[PDB]
Amino acid sequence: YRQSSATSSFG
């Protein structure tokens, strides 16, 4: 799960 809808930068 990506916290705070992680952007492609983080994900």
Side-chain angles (χ1 to χ4, degrees):
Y1 185 100
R2 293 180 180 181
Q3 189 64 55
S4 301
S5 300
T7 63
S8 63
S9 180
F10 293 92

